[PDB]
Structure formats: C-alpha cells, structure tokens
Amino acid sequence: SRRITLNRRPSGLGFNIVGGDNAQGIYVSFISYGGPAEEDGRLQPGDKILQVNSADLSEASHDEAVEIIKKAKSPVNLAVVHDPEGFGRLKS
Amino acid sequence: SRRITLNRRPSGLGFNIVGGDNAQGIYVSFISYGGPAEEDGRLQPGDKILQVNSADLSEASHDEAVEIIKKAKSPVNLAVVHDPEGFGRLKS
C-alpha cells in the first residue's frame, strides 16, 4: 500500500479510472501527460485505489468512485496498491 | 459546426488540447508545424472539439478527452466549432 498526495488543477487530477460493479476494484486507467498525477510521478495504471481522502473505495462501483474522486478536496490523499492482475481481469 | 478529418501519423495528430472539469469544453490549444492538423489547414486553436469519431466531448473532463483523442482510430473525424470565448475563459 502506498500514499500519494495530488493537488487538483482546473484540468483535474491528471488521470482516469475504470471500475466494475461493487467490490471489483477501482483502477487508474490512464495518466494524462503534464497533469498532477504525471508530474507527481508516483501514480501508475495498475494501481488499485483503496482510499480517497479516507473514503474507502474497496466496495465501490465505477460510477460511485468517479463521483467521489471528482468531488474530492483540493489536497487529494490517495491510498493505492499496485494490482496488475486485477486491472487486467477487470478489462472486459 | 465544422467537420475536419485528420489521419494519425506516428508523431500523433499534430495538435494539443486543453480542457477543464466536465462540461467546461475541450479546446485545441496548439497546432504543431508540419503535423497532420497543420498540414490539413482547418483546425485552429480556438476550436472546441464537440465530437471525436462521434464520441461526444461536451461533458468530458480534460483527462478523459486526452485519452479519447489519443485512442481514436484511423481517419479521425473531428466535429469542432470555433469558440474563442470560453477558450479565453478556460485559461483562468
């Protein structure tokens, strides 16, 4: 498990996520070049997001997590854990 | 509204975009000399991208649109509309 603190810009946090139904996991799907996630250097596409400002995303659906991440507060604290197999299974 | 068809080259499509949060608009921010967008002659930096191969970018965030545009296939068809205002607003 890793802690990554990103500050939101008007262009967002600099990454897209993908998830499934509840408890399937929320994964970073894409990292925009030049965004906060990329300029920070730590977030990766295999990373499963466990928490967003303490808000637990373990049991979360994709749309729930999207809304949470979008509404998160300026200094967004992410607890993530790299899970490539889970990311690759959630694909299709 | 205008239709512009560009073919991706290994160096990309020849333009960079900027956007905000969802529904703020996706704008062409820069047109590389010698790229497909510049050699095509139609795309301009004030242009708001409405669609990318039918994929609607109205409600899209910056990072979402970047991933969409980056993944578009073959003859990428852009529906754009010149919006110098709002482009100047997004710069704040």
Place this chain on the structure above:
Amino acid sequence: SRRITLNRRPSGLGFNIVGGDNAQGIYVSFISYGGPAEEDGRLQPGDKILQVNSADLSEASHDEAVEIIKKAKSPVNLAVVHDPEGFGRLK
C-alpha cells in the same frame, strides 16, 4: 538522485533550508508539519538540493538558494539527493 514535485501554497513550500558558502551544498533543514513538503512525504532533512526547476544549486551560497527557492514557479520541481554526512558536516 530523486525527483520531488511540490506545489507552492501561501504558507510556502513547507520546508526551510540551510547552506554555507558557494559549493558547500544546500540542505533541507526542517519540514513544517502540514505543509506541501510534509504532506508530499518525500522530502527529508538530509536531502541536498541539486536543482530547483532545473536551476542548479551545486555552486550556490545559502542566500542565493533561498532567493531561488523563494522565487521558484508554482509547480516546483526539486532534484534532491540524501546526504546526511554532508548535512551533518555543514553543522
């Protein structure tokens, strides 16, 4: 060598430095709790600052580096390298 990106807040970057004469090295001397450096988690008090937004601090005096870091631009990119022995010799 490690890369650390911090965004300036009205309270600064969240750390103080100490240096010597030119070429003695610029070291992070203190990390304010709750600031960008602490909330980022990477910067440490032994870290020798090699670059600030590409600006080389190798040959810099203390006061020069203070002005540079203070004037650095919003997304401040730091190239640092942990040097405890050099930090401890600078006293």
Place this chain on the structure above:
Amino acid sequence: SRRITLNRRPSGLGFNIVGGDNAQGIYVSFISYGGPAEEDGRLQPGDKILQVNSADLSEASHDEAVEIIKKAKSPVNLAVVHDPEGFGRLKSN
C-alpha cells in the same frame, strides 16, 4: 504591543500558528484547551507574533516561524500585538 511569557511543556506551548510568505505576518491560529497558552490566559488567535525570545518574526515566512517557535527556549517570551484584520486577510488567501 503585549508581552506574554509561556513555559514549554512536553505537549508544546499550547497553540498553533499560521503565516504566509516573508513579511506577511505570523498569527496564532489556535489555542489548545489545557495547554500553556490557554492556562496563561493572554494569547489570542488574532495576535500577530512580533518576537519570540527577541527573535524577530516580522520578516519571517510561515515555515521559518514554525521552526523558530518550536526550538525556542523553555521560558518562551513572546512579543505579540493583536491584529484581527491582518489575521483575517491571511485566512482569505
């Protein structure tokens, strides 16, 4: 200008500060109940700290002042002056 002497306890001096860039001012932002600052009764949240054991904080940045106050010596002498307007501006930024 007012003088306030606080003795450090293991739990600190009993207050948190906030400041800005250099010369923006150092303000007491919070006073823990049951701490030295509260039990002393004089420190207030609008108070701009002018000196900490003579060390001048006028030209100090937030992080500089935090480090100074944290290392100050057991019988910490504070020269403060209540400045609510300046405190209220430093919040608005």
